[PDB]
Enzyme design. Structure first.
Site, PDB file in Angstrom:
ATOM      1  N   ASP A  21       0.202  -4.364  40.280  1.00 49.92           N
ATOM      2  CA  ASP A  21       1.763  -4.645  40.541  1.00 49.92           C
ATOM      3  C   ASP A  21       2.575  -3.713  41.313  1.00 49.92           C
ATOM      4  O   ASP A  21       3.776  -3.643  41.105  1.00 49.92           O
ATOM      5  CB  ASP A  21       2.102  -4.513  38.906  1.00 49.92           C
ATOM      6  CG  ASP A  21       3.156  -5.400  38.608  1.00 49.92           C
ATOM      7  OD1 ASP A  21       2.792  -6.742  38.956  1.00 49.92           O
ATOM      8  OD2 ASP A  21       4.352  -5.218  38.095  1.00 49.92           O
ATOM      9  N   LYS A  24       1.721  -5.392  46.162  1.00 48.14           N
ATOM     10  CA  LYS A  24       0.932  -5.776  47.345  1.00 48.14           C
ATOM     11  C   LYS A  24       1.160  -7.277  47.952  1.00 48.14           C
ATOM     12  O   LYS A  24       1.447  -7.126  48.970  1.00 48.14           O
ATOM     13  CB  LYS A  24      -0.729  -5.613  46.929  1.00 48.14           C
ATOM     14  CG  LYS A  24      -0.922  -4.121  46.605  1.00 48.14           C
ATOM     15  CD  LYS A  24      -2.449  -4.114  46.366  1.00 48.14           C
ATOM     16  CE  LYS A  24      -2.279  -5.106  44.977  1.00 48.14           C
ATOM     17  NZ  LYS A  24      -2.056  -4.155  43.700  1.00 48.14           N
ATOM     18  N   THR A  25       1.235  -8.077  46.922  1.00 49.28           N
ATOM     19  CA  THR A  25       1.300  -9.441  47.218  1.00 49.28           C
ATOM     20  C   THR A  25       2.615  -9.475  48.017  1.00 49.28           C
ATOM     21  O   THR A  25       2.958 -10.357  49.068  1.00 49.28           O
ATOM     22  CB  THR A  25       1.069 -10.293  46.293  1.00 49.28           C
ATOM     23  OG1 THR A  25      -0.151  -9.919  45.603  1.00 49.28           O
ATOM     24  CG2 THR A  25       1.155 -11.907  46.624  1.00 49.28           C
ATOM     25  N   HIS A  85      -5.636  -4.829  39.629  1.00 48.43           N
ATOM     26  CA  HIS A  85      -6.206  -4.754  38.181  1.00 48.43           C
ATOM     27  C   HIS A  85      -7.492  -4.259  38.407  1.00 48.43           C
ATOM     28  O   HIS A  85      -8.321  -4.965  38.972  1.00 48.43           O
ATOM     29  CB  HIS A  85      -6.006  -6.325  37.732  1.00 48.43           C
ATOM     30  CG  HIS A  85      -6.429  -6.003  36.384  1.00 48.43           C
ATOM     31  ND1 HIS A  85      -5.407  -6.494  35.187  1.00 48.43           N
ATOM     32  CD2 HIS A  85      -7.334  -5.661  35.509  1.00 48.43           C
ATOM     33  CE1 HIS A  85      -5.836  -6.255  33.952  1.00 48.43           C
ATOM     34  NE2 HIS A  85      -7.012  -5.656  34.139  1.00 48.43           N
TER      35      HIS A  85
HETATM   36  N1  GNP Z   1      12.712  -3.710  42.416  1.00 55.73           N
HETATM   37  C1  GNP Z   1      11.578  -4.046  43.126  1.00 55.73           C
HETATM   38  N2  GNP Z   1      10.839  -5.062  42.170  1.00 55.73           N
HETATM   39  C2  GNP Z   1       9.818  -5.500  43.034  1.00 55.73           C
HETATM   40  C3  GNP Z   1       9.468  -5.096  44.498  1.00 55.73           C
HETATM   41  N3  GNP Z   1       8.494  -5.661  45.016  1.00 55.73           N
HETATM   42  C4  GNP Z   1       7.751  -6.407  43.637  1.00 55.73           C
HETATM   43  N4  GNP Z   1       8.692  -6.224  42.761  1.00 55.73           N
HETATM   44  C5  GNP Z   1       8.152  -6.909  41.774  1.00 55.73           C
HETATM   45  O1  GNP Z   1       6.818  -6.283  41.230  1.00 55.73           O
HETATM   46  C6  GNP Z   1       6.095  -7.395  40.879  1.00 55.73           C
HETATM   47  C7  GNP Z   1       4.720  -7.209  41.277  1.00 55.73           C
HETATM   48  O2  GNP Z   1       4.552  -7.809  42.254  1.00 55.73           O
HETATM   49  P1  GNP Z   1       3.087  -8.112  42.980  1.00 55.73           P
HETATM   50  O3  GNP Z   1       3.728  -8.201  44.449  1.00 55.73           O
HETATM   51  O4  GNP Z   1       2.381  -9.067  42.658  1.00 55.73           O
HETATM   52  O5  GNP Z   1       2.291  -6.869  42.977  1.00 55.73           O
HETATM   53  P2  GNP Z   1       0.668  -6.469  43.298  1.00 55.73           P
HETATM   54  O6  GNP Z   1       0.718  -5.117  43.842  1.00 55.73           O
HETATM   55  O7  GNP Z   1       0.176  -7.762  43.989  1.00 55.73           O
HETATM   56  N5  GNP Z   1       0.136  -6.869  41.925  1.00 55.73           N
HETATM   57  P3  GNP Z   1      -1.468  -7.065  41.394  1.00 55.73           P
HETATM   58  O8  GNP Z   1      -1.889  -5.815  41.203  1.00 55.73           O
HETATM   59  O9  GNP Z   1      -1.459  -8.115  40.423  1.00 55.73           O
HETATM   60  O10 GNP Z   1      -1.832  -8.053  42.645  1.00 55.73           O
HETATM   61  C8  GNP Z   1       6.518  -8.506  41.208  1.00 55.73           C
HETATM   62  O11 GNP Z   1       7.516  -8.662  40.117  1.00 55.73           O
HETATM   63  C9  GNP Z   1       7.502  -8.166  42.395  1.00 55.73           C
HETATM   64  O12 GNP Z   1       8.499  -9.136  42.565  1.00 55.73           O
HETATM   65  C10 GNP Z   1      10.293  -4.190  45.120  1.00 55.73           C
HETATM   66  O13 GNP Z   1      10.095  -3.971  46.251  1.00 55.73           O
HETATM   67  N6  GNP Z   1      11.462  -3.707  44.259  1.00 55.73           N
HETATM   68 MG    MG Z   2      -0.510  -9.716  43.406  1.00 53.85          MG
END
Ligand code: GNP
Ligand code: MG
Ligand code: PHE
Ligand code: MG
Length: 405
Positions: A21, A24-25, A85
């Site tokens: 989280d 990355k995505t 994860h």
């Molecule tokens: N304030 C803030 N919140 C953010 C930002 N980027 C993401 N969030 C939220 O953080 C969460 C994790 O987003 P995600 O992009 O899935 O992360 P990940 O790194 O892919 N996670 P995973 O480990 O499951 O693949 C999502 O709710 C995203 O919208 C950011 O730049 N700022």
């Molecule tokens: Mg993700």
RNA sequence: GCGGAUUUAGCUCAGUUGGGAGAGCGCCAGACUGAAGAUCUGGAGGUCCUGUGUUCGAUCCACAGAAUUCGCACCA
């Protein structure tokens, strides 16, 4: 299926890694948007466009890795977005195994976390030579000291697994905000927006810091399977990143490893992001149609090589480093008979460790050297690096030292 | 890729809540019968699929592999 692929810039593989989280995505999709703006034919992708299988949509996490395409003026990129994860490190290892550089995302609000460490080390055991870091979630924080701190830690961690943490580019930002912005408006360009502009910084870092590799298009063809599909009307497709040499339709190849006997086929298709390629060369993240092989006969972990060009193996001496409990490792020594899992490129196979004479039990933090006897044959080569994971964790990092069988 | 089941004697299956397994067929000895099948008395046969964690101790639990199965996802 939809268009032909035409070389006009250098090609480089990249992708996303970092603790779960950390964003990355989001950042992935945000890169697509922005590049799309100053480079037409960059098809953009939203989150849903990426984390799209339902549990992913449901649980709100990345589980499978995703390939996305995108470019800048300078180059063309295939970007692998990996899951953070810990339950899904194999996927991640498989993606990182195709990167030429990895973007290591670290949430500024959380600082370095476990897979931050893990990913860095795993990237390495898988061949990633450069890492650019993107300190995300900045929007969420303003004490500069806390920012500045997270940077240090990140760098220092990099140093640990020996990436030039001192020189590694470290971009701070909010990916959410960039994305959001492109949502309001797709056509933003550099300078127009703060948040967006940080992505240009990332994009630049990637353009600049990750050198485009040398490609040994001359050595025999070698491509490690990353995935396999069954395609409509056409057949069995193997996807991967060309290690060295090349292919074009009509060439016959060898599916080596993870099985009794190796098997032959002629490649009948060559694509790159669903677009025809005359001939794919070393560095291409391609897809290959193979004459009459079922999904059963081809699978991730095996390898495509020049017929006869390669020998699958089973035993080998190896110089290894066992991780400290502290580094996310084991907290009890092991002995002969221990059978964890070995990861070489996109391959992961179980092997029985045999301690040399003079060594009875290997403790967390040691640097041993021993023999392994894999439960399946696989494409090895001395000097080949690997990771040892067991029970849900990474326990060691070693390199082939000599091939026994 | 993800997730569930299943793996126990030559065969097919039962047990279990960590102190370590049990039956039907199948073998064998003694009885009966020319013999066989039924019956009767005994008797033998298992790294409890594997590694690691936990634990004084792991067949059993946890975490990880294999093999078989069955859902689900992905879609050059
Ligand atoms: N304030 C803030 N919140 C953010 C930002 N980027 C993401 N969030 C939220 O953080 C969460 C994790 O987003 P995600 O992009 O899935 O992360 P990940 O790194 O892919 N996670 P995973 O480990 O499951 O693949 C999502 O709710 C995203 O919208 C950011 O730049 N700022
Ligand atoms: Mg993700
Ligand atoms: C085909 O698109 C490959 N060249 C790019 C790719 C897409 C999806 C999965 C794996 C590779
Ligand atoms: Mg179990």
């Amino acid at each position: 299926a939809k268009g032909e692929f035409i070389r006009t810039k250098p090609h480089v593989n990249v992708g996303t890694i970092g603790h779960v989280d950390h964003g990355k995505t989001t950042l992935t999709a945000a890169l697509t948007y922005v590049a799309a703006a100053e480079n037409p034919n960059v098809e953009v992708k939203d989150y849903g466009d990426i984390d799209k299988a339902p549990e992913e949509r449901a649980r709100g996490i990345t589980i499978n890795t995703a390939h996305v395409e995108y470019e800048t003026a300078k180059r063309h990129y295939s970007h692998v977005d990996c899951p953070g994860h810990a339950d899904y490190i194999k996927n991640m290892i498989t993606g990182a195994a195709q990167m030429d550089g990895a973007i290591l995302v670290v949430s500024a609000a959380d600082g370095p976390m476990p897979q931050t460490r893990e990913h860095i080390l795993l990237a390495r055991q898988v061949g990633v030579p450069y890492i650019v870091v993107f300190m995300n979630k900045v929007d969420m924080v303003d004490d500069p000291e806390l920012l500045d701190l997270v940077e240090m830690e990140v760098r220092d961690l990099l140093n640990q697994y020996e990436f030039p943490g001192d020189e590694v580019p470290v971009i701070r930002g909010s990916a959410l905000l960039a994305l959001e912005e492109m949502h309001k408006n797709p056509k933003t360009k550099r300078g127009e927006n703060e948040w967006v502009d940080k992505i240009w910084e990332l994009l630049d870092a990637i353009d600049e810091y990750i050198p485009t590799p040398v490609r040994d298009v001359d050595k025999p063809f070698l491509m490690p399977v990353e995935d396999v599909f069954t395609i409509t009307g056409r057949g069995t497709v193997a996807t991967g990143r060309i290690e060295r040499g090349k292919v074009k339709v009509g060439d016959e190849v060898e599916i080596v490893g993870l099985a009794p006997e190796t098997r032959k086929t002629v490649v009948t298709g060559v694509e790159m992001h669903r677009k025809t390629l005359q001939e794919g060369i070393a560095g291409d993240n391609v897809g290959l149609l193979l004459r009459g092989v079922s999904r059963e006969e081809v699978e991730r972990g095996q390898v495509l090589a020049k017929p006869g060009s390669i020998t699958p193996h089973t035993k080998f001496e190896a110089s290894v480093y066992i991780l400290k409990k502290e580094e996310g490792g084991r907290h009890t020594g092991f002995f002969t008979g221990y059978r964890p899992q070995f990861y070489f490129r996109t391959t992961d196979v179980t092997g029985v460790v045999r301690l040399p004479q003079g060594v009875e039990m290997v403790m967390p933090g040691d640097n041993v050297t021993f023999t392994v006897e894999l439960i399946k044959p696989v494409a090895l080569e001395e000097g080949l690096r690997f990771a040892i994971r067991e029970g849900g964790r990474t326990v060691g990092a070693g390199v082939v030292t000599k091939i026994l069988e």
